[PDB]
């Protein structure tokens, strides 16, 4: 069979698209198993109880498998052993990376904000029809990744998939069960802070500088206020067991739409550089700021090479 897996610190995408091109996959006779490379947010493990869904199972070694790549092309985002194992698939909405193979497969990438919008057109292609739970997760991984359309990664195949797959999953208010989502993000109080840097952290080489950057998407920026400086503590102990140049956290209101980001920086003056708003006591709010790949990222990348 093949694995269909997302990136390492899987997201709701990840997930849900493995769960969701798995079954299409077994369904037109091409037998697939979804996997994982990493524990589930708490955001993702209420999507699969809420339709009904055990989580895919957790895989780190794929040598000599074929595998069904999920919302990267990137070999860092890849399992540790990617090379030793055969590719036959990417579904995916970013930038084509350095994932390369030796034998044909299927890519399909469209510049859209989420994989579950593909891979709901890959059901279409094939002319099956998307049960009601898995449309629903699918369903899910737009408003997660679009921000229930307030990220500006979010486009017109997403809105207009979103509300298709709301009707065949027999959801009335998909922006309840959004909002329903990003409760569940905001609920951090008794989370290690640790835990919290992590949940969705990534490591970038900005022209030979080690940039780790954590984010968090919650209701209300208040949740944070008891447990702030704990964070602002874990950044700089995790710069120091990393060697990292560079350790920011993005704390994003999903109504305010914007992000307080807390820094650590051997750059004294990175956030007034980078995004023309200077860092108070290792804090700036940014106004208008949801996607880290969009608004947060090229404007650090950018002040590496100047
Ligand atoms: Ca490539
Ligand atoms: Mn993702
Ligand atoms: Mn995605």
């Given at each position: 069979s093949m694995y269909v897996v997302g990136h390492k610190i899987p997201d709701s995408d990840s997930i849900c698209g493995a769960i969701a091109l798995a079954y299409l996959k077994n369904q037109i006779g091409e037998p697939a198993i979804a996997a994982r490379l990493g524990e589930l947010s708490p955001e993702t493990a209420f999507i699969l109880e809420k339709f009904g869904f055990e989580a895919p199972e957790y895989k780190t070694s794929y040598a000599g498998e074929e595998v069904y790549i999920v919302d990267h092309s990137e070999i860092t985002q890849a399992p540790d052993d990617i090379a030793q194992a055969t590719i036959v698939g990417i579904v995916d909405h970013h930038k084509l990376g350095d994932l390369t193979t030796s034998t044909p497969l299927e890519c399909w990438i469209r510049?859209?904000?989420?994989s579950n919008t593909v891979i709901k057109m890959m059901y279409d292609f094939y002319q099956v029809k998307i049960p009601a739970n898995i449309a629903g997760i699918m369903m899910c991984a737009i408003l997660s990744d679009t921000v229930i359309f307030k990220?500006?990664?979010?486009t017109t195949a997403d809105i207009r998939c979103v509300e298709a797959l709301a009707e065949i999953a027999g959801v009335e208010d998909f922006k309840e069960v959004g909002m329903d989502m990003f409760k569940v993000k905001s609920?951090?109080?008794?989370?290690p802070a640790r835990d919290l840097v992590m949940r969705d952290f990534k490591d970038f080489n900005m022209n030979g500088n080690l940039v780790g950057i954590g984010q968090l998407e919650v209701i209300?920026?208040?949740?944070?206020?008891?447990?702030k400086a704990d964070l602002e503590a874990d950044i700089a102990k995790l710069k120091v067991e990393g060697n990292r140049h560079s350790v920011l956290l993005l704390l994003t209101d999903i109504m305010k739409e914007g992000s307080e980001m807390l820094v650590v920086s051997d750059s004294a003056d990175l956030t007034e550089r980078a995004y023309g708003k200077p860092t108070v006591d290792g804090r700036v709010w940014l106004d208008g700021v949801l996607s880290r790949k969009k608004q947060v990222v090229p404007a650090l990348q950018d002040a590496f090479q100047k």
């Amino acid at each position: 069979s093949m694995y269909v897996v997302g990136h390492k610190i899987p997201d709701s995408d990840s997930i849900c698209g493995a769960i969701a091109l798995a079954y299409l996959k077994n369904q037109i006779g091409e037998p697939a198993i979804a996997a994982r490379l990493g524990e589930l947010s708490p955001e993702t493990a209420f999507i699969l109880e809420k339709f009904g869904f055990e989580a895919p199972e957790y895989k780190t070694s794929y040598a000599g498998e074929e595998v069904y790549i999920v919302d990267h092309s990137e070999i860092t985002q890849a399992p540790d052993d990617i090379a030793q194992a055969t590719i036959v698939g990417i579904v995916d909405h970013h930038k084509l990376g350095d994932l390369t193979t030796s034998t044909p497969l299927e890519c399909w990438i469209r510049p859209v904000g989420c994989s579950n919008t593909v891979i709901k057109m890959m059901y279409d292609f094939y002319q099956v029809k998307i049960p009601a739970n898995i449309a629903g997760i699918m369903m899910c991984a737009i408003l997660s990744d679009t921000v229930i359309f307030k990220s500006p990664t979010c486009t017109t195949a997403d809105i207009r998939c979103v509300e298709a797959l709301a009707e065949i999953a027999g959801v009335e208010d998909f922006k309840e069960v959004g909002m329903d989502m990003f409760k569940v993000k905001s609920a951090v109080e008794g989370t290690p802070a640790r835990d919290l840097v992590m949940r969705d952290f990534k490591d970038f080489n900005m022209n030979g500088n080690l940039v780790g950057i954590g984010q968090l998407e919650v209701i209300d920026l208040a949740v944070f206020d008891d447990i702030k400086a704990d964070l602002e503590a874990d950044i700089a102990k995790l710069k120091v067991e990393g060697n990292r140049h560079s350790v920011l956290l993005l704390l994003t209101d999903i109504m305010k739409e914007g992000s307080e980001m807390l820094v650590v920086s051997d750059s004294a003056d990175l956030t007034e550089r980078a995004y023309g708003k200077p860092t108070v006591d290792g804090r700036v709010w940014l106004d208008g700021v949801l996607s880290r790949k969009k608004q947060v990222v090229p404007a650090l990348q950018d002040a590496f090479q100047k």
